[PDB]
Amino acid sequence: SVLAAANPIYGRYDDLKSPGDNIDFQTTILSAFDMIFIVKDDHNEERDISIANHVINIHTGNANAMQNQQEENGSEISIEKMKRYITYCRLKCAPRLSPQAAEKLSSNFVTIRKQLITIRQLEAIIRITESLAKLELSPIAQERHVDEAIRLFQASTMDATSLSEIRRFEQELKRRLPIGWSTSYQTLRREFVDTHRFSQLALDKALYALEKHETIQLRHQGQNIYRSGV
Amino acid sequence: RYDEIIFRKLGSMLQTTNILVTDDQYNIWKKRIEMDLA
């Protein structure tokens, strides 16, 4: 098993670009990994304060006592005990999928394919639920593993009749926002969602699709929205 | 309040000036002190 940490070119992964343009290597490599994680570090007030608090706690030496107490509480596993558990899980159990898990995977992958990733991705997702079943030593893989597997797949690969409503929102925004104009996420909320012209999920999905379709650009964490094209 | 806002926006001398304590605030202070005074 290979875990590869790669630095995107230009140093910072530009969100205006397809992942192929922020990468310098053979394109087929993207077809080799099961998942990619384009993690972002956009500046934020409270999250940075919490992270700073954690780092100061670590440098203070309080983290040692906190981890010891958490291990005593059973909320944290010792690294040696964790390794022993991993070896035991690897050596003993070998689960297999269930029909209930397969059908939801097929339906969700059909929806993803229709929206657009190859058939290889659906079979790769099976590895995640098999791994989770191995973790639980369950005799079979389960749909409750498939939920988290799908969430991770969505939050990893997609880093860069409701579809009819989404596209109607896109059309209504193309009428509402001329090319070159600017607006804000809260303004769109107040004018379209608070007026119940469209749902909030439709708002988010339409903004996401339009950003990928080069129609609009999101700026300053949603405080500014600019239509970059048709 | 609506009248005070439009008076302030209009720059009218009818609007009171907040240099002295307001009537309501001083009345509440007087009532709260007097209620425990006797």
Binding site: R176, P178, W181 | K9
Partner: protein
Amino acid sequence: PSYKSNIEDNLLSWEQVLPDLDKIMAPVLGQLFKLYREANMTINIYDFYIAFRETL
């Protein structure tokens, strides 16, 4: 006075001036000034009319 700022605020904050369609829709001038603030430096007037129509 802040002559410019006062007019801009009245356009944007008409509730500070004004006290059954009258209860819902603001005066057209301020609602159009909203788009004007949202507008770019140069405007194709047909698109501006379309947006104003859509807001009504």
